[PDB]
Amino acid sequence: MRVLGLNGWPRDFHDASAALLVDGRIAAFAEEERFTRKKHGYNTAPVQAAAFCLAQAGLTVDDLDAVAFGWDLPAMYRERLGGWPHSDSEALDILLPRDVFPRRTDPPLHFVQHHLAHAASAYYFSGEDRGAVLIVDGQGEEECVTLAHAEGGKITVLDTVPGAWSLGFFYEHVSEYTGLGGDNPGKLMGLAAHGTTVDETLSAFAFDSDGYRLNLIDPQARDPEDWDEYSVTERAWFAHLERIYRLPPNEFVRRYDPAKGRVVRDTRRDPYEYRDLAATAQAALERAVFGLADSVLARTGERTLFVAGGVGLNATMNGKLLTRSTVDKMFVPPVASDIGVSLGAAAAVAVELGDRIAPMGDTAAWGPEFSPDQVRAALDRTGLAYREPANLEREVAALIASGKVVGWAQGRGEVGPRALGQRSLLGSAHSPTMRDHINLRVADREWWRPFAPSMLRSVSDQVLEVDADFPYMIMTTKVRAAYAERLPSVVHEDWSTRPQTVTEASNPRYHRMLTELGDLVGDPVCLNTSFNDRGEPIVSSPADALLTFSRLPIDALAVGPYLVTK
Ligand SMILES: Nc1ncnc2c1ncn2[C@@H]1O[C@H](COP(=O)(O)OP(=O)(O)OP(=O)(O)O)[C@@H](O)[C@H]1O
Numbered sequence: 001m002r003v004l005g006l007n008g009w010p011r012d013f014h015d016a017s018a019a020l021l022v023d024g025r026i027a028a029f030a031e032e033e034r035f036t037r038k039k040h041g042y043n044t045a046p047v048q049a050a051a052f053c054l055a056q057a058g059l060t061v062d063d064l065d066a067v068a069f070g071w072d073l074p075a076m077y078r079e080r081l082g083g084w085p086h087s088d089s090e091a092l093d094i095l096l097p098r099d100v101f102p103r104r105t106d107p108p109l110h111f112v113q114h115h116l117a118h119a120a121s122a123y124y125f126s127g128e129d130r131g132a133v134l135i136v137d138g139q140g141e142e143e144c145v146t147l148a149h150a151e152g153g154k155i156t157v158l159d160t161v162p163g164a165w166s167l168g169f170f171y172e173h174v175s176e177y178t179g180l181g182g183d184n185p186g187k188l189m190g191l192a193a194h195g196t197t198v199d200e201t202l203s204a205f206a207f208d209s210d211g212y213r214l215n216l217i218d219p220q221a222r223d224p225e226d227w228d229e230y231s232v233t234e235r236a237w238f239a240h241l242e243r244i245y246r247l248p249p250n251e252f253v254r255r256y257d258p259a260k261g262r263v264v265r266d267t268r269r270d271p272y273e274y275r276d277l278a279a280t281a282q283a284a285l286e287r288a289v290f291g292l293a294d295s296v297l298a299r300t301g302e303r304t305l306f307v308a309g310g311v312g313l314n315a316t317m318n319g320k321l322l323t324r325s326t327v328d329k330m331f332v333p334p335v336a337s338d339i340g341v342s343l344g345a346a347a348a349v350a351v352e353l354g355d356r357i358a359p360m361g362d363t364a365a366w367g368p369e370f371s372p373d374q375v376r377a378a379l380d381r382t383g384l385a386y387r388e389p390a391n392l393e394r395e396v397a398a399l400i401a402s403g404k405v406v407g408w409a410q411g412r413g414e415v416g417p418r419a420l421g422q423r424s425l426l427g428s429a430h431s432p433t434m435r436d437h438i439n440l441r442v443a444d445r446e447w448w449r450p451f452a453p454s455m456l457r458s459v460s461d462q463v464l465e466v467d468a469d470f471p472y473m474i475m476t477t478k479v480r481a482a483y484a485e486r487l488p489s490v491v492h493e494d495w496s497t498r499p500q501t502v503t504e505a506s507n508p509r510y511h512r513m514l515t516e517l518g519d520l521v522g523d524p525v526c527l528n529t530s531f532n533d534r535g536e537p538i539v540s541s542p543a544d545a546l547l548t549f550s551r552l553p554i555d556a557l558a559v560g561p562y563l564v565t566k
């Protein structure tokens, strides 16, 4: 079957994306923000993402067997807004506007329960017959957690936790409270390592062997003036945090900066001041999730764990789950957050139509790519001088080895929040100054945020405690003896790293470049951070890449077969 999965809707929505499954294979998959250049794909149907999916596969909406949406949207409208007003035809017009998506007739429209869609995005793509499913995000239609059993192509729900007890809202609210912002929970995670935990309950959580309790909030509390429990949980957490924590909420400051010529936003306090709150929030999330995972694993009798939902992006928590006595194998897709429910809704529907879903296979490179002619066109636009190296991979290897920062734009854009050698900024993993150089001089990131490494899968065994595939940079692990000293720029406060393992199959060019690199610095490892300026999404087009390259004190840009220098 050909099934187009969708996320994103014009009203109060985030992380719009589109995914096209052809006979269980990912034909194309991209996030709206990459095309709009507006981070998080807020309040929109995934118009551009779906246009790309169809163009990539050479299809039109008339060639689709089904369109799948990753939430039970009619149900949310019925419950929270007094009725679902749209015929399937009218819903399609909104999701896939006719001026961009001409169609003779309407494809069958399927609405998939949000957490099922999450679950589908992990199970069906993991390459594992069966396992325990843990879904933890902000909130689906009603629930914030789902425990389920996956076996023989079926996902069966054992239990859910109501939205008011959301661990994602919780973590988001703490992230907002510190000044990092509720849209930047990943930063809270990186700040945790720098602080100290004293009471991992925050006088709110009570932990047990199957999970947690939030005696702070009535679990059946509900916003009658909205369609999720964000605002209710926000008021409760903010009041509680202010009550028990020495610092009041950090405030946002909007002021004209005559240096930028603009009103810029900042924080009244340095978020680094809240490092103990971050540590404590991180510890509480871990503890709560450990209980949930132990619980679903035991109730199912499985020892393989599938995790998805937005909290699933907590790589630190993931790494620690992996090493838990109760877990032998773990799969967490690069698209754990809502970006992944388009793909999940599509799989659920495809499987329902009799298809078998192929494993992801250690790659996330499903977005657009660009030919040499298309790249050259973008280069000539700018009038920049460039070369076409005989051995680009070797030249990049050498640049990196000498302490230079190289933009790397090749092949099909990766999907999800991590760059994985399709749209990356590259630098020495071996340099004890590279990290401060990129944070402070290049990207204006907070000095306390860590960077992460890409390395060959064939030496990952010797570099890292664990010998597993880490294709997605969605898990932290410990660095073996005594590489922990050899790789200063990609190590975090606690000797953990958040690695990408690379196989020749998954990324030949990148694999080859790392190989060359190894001959020069001994180790086929590099620093790999995402290719973007501070506000914007990861660069997608060759034009995006040039623009960002012009704006950053980077040394070179390797885009397609071409090398551009500063
Ligand atoms: N080994 C590690 N241990 C703990 N945290 C880590 C580790 N490696 C990376 N991180 C954190 O993961 C975060 C990812 O968060 P997030 O996705 O919000 O950043 P980003 O979107 O890449 O940043 P930007 O604002 O530049 O787009 C990093 O900012 C860093 O704080």
Ligand SMILES: Nc1ncnc2c1ncn2[C@@H]1O[C@H](COP(=O)(O)OP(=O)(O)O)[C@@H](O)[C@H]1O
Binding pocket: 015, 136, 137, 138, 139, 140, 167, 168, 169, 170, 171, 172, 185, 186, 189, 285, 309, 310, 311, 312, 313, 314, 315, 336, 337, 338, 339
């Ligand atoms: N690194 C992280 N650690 C913990 N929670 C995270 C992290 N990244 C994202 N989240 C959580 O994901 C939640 C939203 O997840 P998602 O499933 O994408 O949306 P929704 O909750 O609307 O379905 C947010 O509440 C956020 O706190």
Ligand SMILES: [Fe+2]
Binding pocket: 114, 118, 137, 138, 139, 140, 309, 310, 337, 338
């Ligand atoms: Fe979700």
Ligand SMILES: [K+]
Binding pocket: 322, 323, 324, 325, 326, 327, 328
């Ligand atoms: K283990």
Ligand SMILES: [Mg+2]
Binding pocket: 529, 530, 531, 532
């Ligand atoms: Mg980044």
